[PDB]
Write a protein that binds this ligand. Structure first.
Ligand SMILES: COC(=O)N[C@H](C(=O)N[C@@H](Cc1ccccc1)C[C@H](O)[C@H](Cc1ccccc1)NC(=O)O[C@H]1CO[C@H]2OCC[C@H]21)C(C)(C)C
Lengths: 99, 99
């Protein structure tokens, strides 16, 4: 679909079999989801944005369905204020910016 | 034009008589630019990213040209690591997400 930006570009995602709302974020290198339980091994990591760094758990090769499009890639889980879908997964679903 | 998300969507902007590189950020409500001495009145504001909040200066009705497309709105100035074009200006240039 084509999504305008008058409102936050929020979509429903499915991850670990659970539905959630997330922000399609061209300004995020990585995908960062609020605290949740996910199956599989994980490594501690840290990521920075505006305001400083947060500590996250990095899950690799996680299945996630974004607005009906499947992706398999790295998902960071931590105390992010909003679920954000970053470029590592936006590229997989074929998302582009257009004007 | 169309912009893929393999790399950060960095483009040239023109503001206050200067050329800069900035990030087209669908995950940003607001536009935040690296420290610069714009003329005119401003008001203090605080904006939050994933790591917390920073102090910025809010300038209103500022013209920014983004890839030849003009937009006029509120521009925040403060200690951000990257020039960020947010939805308040991306809407004015007819920018959409497409997949
Ligand atoms: C309403 O609040 C807002 O709109 N705040 C805006 C904001 O911060 N939005 C966040 C999400 C958010 C956070 C908090 C509340 C609501 C939404 C997403 C945004 O695109 C940032 C931009 C950014 C790129 C590079 C370095 C620092 C920042 N990207 C990011 O933090 O990405 C992370 C993840 O991936 C990594 O790559 C880049 C840095 C890493 C802003 C106006 C301050 C800019």
């Amino acid at each position: 679909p084509q999504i305008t930006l008058w409102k936050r570009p929020l979509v429903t995602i499915k991850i670990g079999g659970q539905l959630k709302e997330a922000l399609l974020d061209t300004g995020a290198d990585d995908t960062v989801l609020e605290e949740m339980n996910l199956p599989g091994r994980w490594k501690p990591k840290m990521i920075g944005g505006i305001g400083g760094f947060i500590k996250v758990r990095q899950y690799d090769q996680i299945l996630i369905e974004i607005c009906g499009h499947k992706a398999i890639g790295t998902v960071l889980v931590g105390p992010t204020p909003v679920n954000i879908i970053g470029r590592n997964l936006l590229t997989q679903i074929g998302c582009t910016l257009n004007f």
